[PDB]
């Protein structure tokens, strides 16, 4: 990992933000060399990302480099599409929508340059309609370029070019899975399918699709434009790259910054800009993932670098790329229930473990917080959480327990004493 | 709320403006043929727009356009959230309350509305124009307890100026759907500067 950073220069993977929002020639960075890329054999791009080997921003492992050079090697009778989440499911994510808001010109390229690797046919994106204003403008961004003849059907210089069809959702979590999105792109109700039909690259719209994420297809052109040998810059021999973090919930100026891997949380939280709560003596009870990781106390987290597998060393890792912390007044038990009260409303409801199994917790979590009937429950409530893992289809269950699974870990007494606080009270 | 209809507007009636039948030519043009069969998500919502909440004869109408048995519609309108099956007001307002939005005390931008606006939660104002809810997972938690009105959002709010954002709206004034105070774009501040540059003299991976 080198020098234990993760610095930020003007040399980064994102071109500009406050400079130019509208269309043009991509005055400096973008749309630079194209006809040379596409005219060379497609699999040249395939595995040429391996110089980086992006883990992927979809909240998981499984480097993006494999799945595209993965099946969808051949082609037979039926077209292939691209479905790239723009959605945000996790509370406090916020990383998305900043990419789109002030610089859309990147991703329409990101597909066209990207889609050629798939050998795909069309391009769908998807956006939660809950963003009405910013999402409305992409069409202009599509038009303001696409109208110039930059895309389709040969554009430019190849015999292969195809346009991008925006769509919208409503009350979606649906980006909560692939093999759901490709279902509610269709117009059924969205109940995500079983994971191994034929996994997500066989059963699809009518025909094989691949579900990418935003900065997985956003940073691909610039990492195939230059690459290197700088493609692997920070992070150890395992995880490599520089992703975006967006700090939220206590800071001086919670705001995004581009930061490379293996950055410790004690300098990163304090920096960009201040630590404005107590940098210490505010107890710094932290959540690595947005909703997908339980607490860490004042322990090795602060020295624990943000590298992925570095977090699997602790009791939980995070792929979500977000930060929420706390200081003093926020009662964690009080502040984790409204993370659970959230889950109960976003779940499909097919499976018997998820449905009727999350409420069993959510109905009891309003006992502990309020303070109420006796311990030895905690010992059970742990087993429930241990009882939903292989039992649910999607990850929302595997992402349902961890907050409670990792609350019972790391804080014993805060509960034990409160059940007394109402016990002595009853007396 | 309940998900059964007590025969309100089986024949409301309802219909689309002949200006709208020329767009539905474009929507279906998106998809491939023979699978078309659901554009329902925009098409059912466009109908909400022409009206402002869709009665049960709206749900039956699109079926005659899309030839799907209209329990393959009543379903889809009871799953998602954005659609409003019952009637609503002129402004349908949201208060984000979630772990981050709780930490910055969204209750600030929430109540003190009951003392101002003078209505309870989940209840439309006695006339029309106002109602109140709360939701989860929209936009940014990087901002303050942000608030949504209808088609816009007011980021980085406080109890002091939201008194205005409603009250200037009661006057008919629309106050700039952006994070009115602090930093306008939600900037890093701490390395915001960066001095943008062309991409380092390309010709790089030309090989």
């Amino acid at each position: 990992f080198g020098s234990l950073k993760d610095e930020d220069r003007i040399f980064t993977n994102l071109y500009g933000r406050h400079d130019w929002r509208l269309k043009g020639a991509q005055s400096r960075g973008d749309w630079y060399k194209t006809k040379e890329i596409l005219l060379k054999g497609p699999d040249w791009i395939l595995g040429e990302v391996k110089t980086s080997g992006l883990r992927g921003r979809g909240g998981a492992g499984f480097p993006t480099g494999l799945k595209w050079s993965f099946m969808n090697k051949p082609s037979d009778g039926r077209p292939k599409y691209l479905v790239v989440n723009a959605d945000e499911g996790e509370p406090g994510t916020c990383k998305d929508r900043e990419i789109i808001r002030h610089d859309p010109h990147k991703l329409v390229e990101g597909c066209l340059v990207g889609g050629r690797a798939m050998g795909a046919r069309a391009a769908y994106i998807y956006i939660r309609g809950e963003f009405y204003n910013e999402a409305s403008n992409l069409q202009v961004a599509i038009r303001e370029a696409y109208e110039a003849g930059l895309i389709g059907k040969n554009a430019c210089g190849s015999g292969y070019d195809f346009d991008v069809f925006v769509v919208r959702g409503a009350g979606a979590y649906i980006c909560g899975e692939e093999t759901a999105l490709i279902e509610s792109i269709e117009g059924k109700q969205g109940k995500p399918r079983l994971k191994p039909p034929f996994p997500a690259d066989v059963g699809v719209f009518g025909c094989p699709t691949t579900v990418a994420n935003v900065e997985t297809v956003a940073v691909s052109p610039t990492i195939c434009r230059r690459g290197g040998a700088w493609f692997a810059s920070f992070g150890r021999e395992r995880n490599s790259g520089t992703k975006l973090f967006n700090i939220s919930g206590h800071v001086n100026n919670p705001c995004t910054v581009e930061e490379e891997m293996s950055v410790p949380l004690k300098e990163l939280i304090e920096k960009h800009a201040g630590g404005v709560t107590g940098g210490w003596d505010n107890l710094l009870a932290v959540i690595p993932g947005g909703s997908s990781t339980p607490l860490i106390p004042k322990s090795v987290c602060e020295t624990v670098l943000m590298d992925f597998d570095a977090l699997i060393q602790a009791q939980t890792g995070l792929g979500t790329a977000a930060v929420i912390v706390m200081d003093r007044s926020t009662d964690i038990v009080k502040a984790i229930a409204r993370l659970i009260e959230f889950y109960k409303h976003e779940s499909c409801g097919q499976c018997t473990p998820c449905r009727e199994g999350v409420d069993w917790m959510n109905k009891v979590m309003a006992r502990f917080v309020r303070g109420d009937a006796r311990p030895a429950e905690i010992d059970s409530l742990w087993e429930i959480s241990k009882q939903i893992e292989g039992h649910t289809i999607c990850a929302l269950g595997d992402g349902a327990a961890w907050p409670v699974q990792g609350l019972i870990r790391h804080f014993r007494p805060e509960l034990e004493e409160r059940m007394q606080q109402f016990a002595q009270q009853h007396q | 709320v309940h998900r059964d209809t007590p025969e309100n507007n089986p024949e409301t009636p309802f219909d689309f403006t002949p200006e709208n039948y020329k767009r539905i030519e474009a929507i279906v043009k998106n998809y491939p043929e023979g699978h078309k069969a659901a554009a329902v998500l925009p098409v059912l919502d466009l109908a909400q727009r022409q009206n402002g909440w869709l009665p049960i004869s709206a749900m039956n109408k699109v079926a005659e356009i899309l030839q799907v048995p209209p329990m393959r519609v009543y379903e889809v309108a009871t799953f998602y959230t954005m659609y409003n099956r019952k009637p609503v007001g002129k402004y349908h307002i949201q208060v984000c309350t979630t772990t981050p939005c709780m930490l910055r005390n969204s209750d600030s931008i929430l109540e003190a509305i009951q003392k101002k606006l003078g209505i309870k939660v989940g209840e439309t104002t006695p006339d029309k124009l106002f109602t109140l809810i709360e939701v989860e997972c929209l936009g940014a938690c990087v901002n303050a307890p942000m608030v949504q009105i209808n088609d816009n959002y007011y980021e980085d709010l406080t109890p002091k100026d939201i008194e205005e954002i409603i009250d200037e709206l009661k006057a008919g004034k629309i106050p700039k759907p952006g994070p009115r105070s602090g930093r306008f774009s939600c900037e890093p501040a701490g390395g915001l500067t960066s001095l943008t540059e062309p991409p380092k003299g390309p010709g790089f991976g030309v090989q």
Binding site: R78, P79, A122, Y132, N133, S136, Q139, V140, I142, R143, Y146, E147, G152, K153, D163, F165, G206 | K22, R23, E25, A26, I27, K29, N30, Y31, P32, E33, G34, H35, L46, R49, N150, D151
Partner: peptide
């Protein structure tokens, strides 16, 4: 900013410039 009026966004430049589609069939 334009509350209604997705029209030309959907039907102006998109309508003419979304070729072909071939899209096949799927009769079924």
């Amino acid at each position: 900013y334009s509350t209604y009026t997705f029209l030309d966004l959907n039907l102006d430049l998109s309508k003419f410039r979304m070729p072909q589609p071939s899209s096949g069939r799927e009769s079924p």
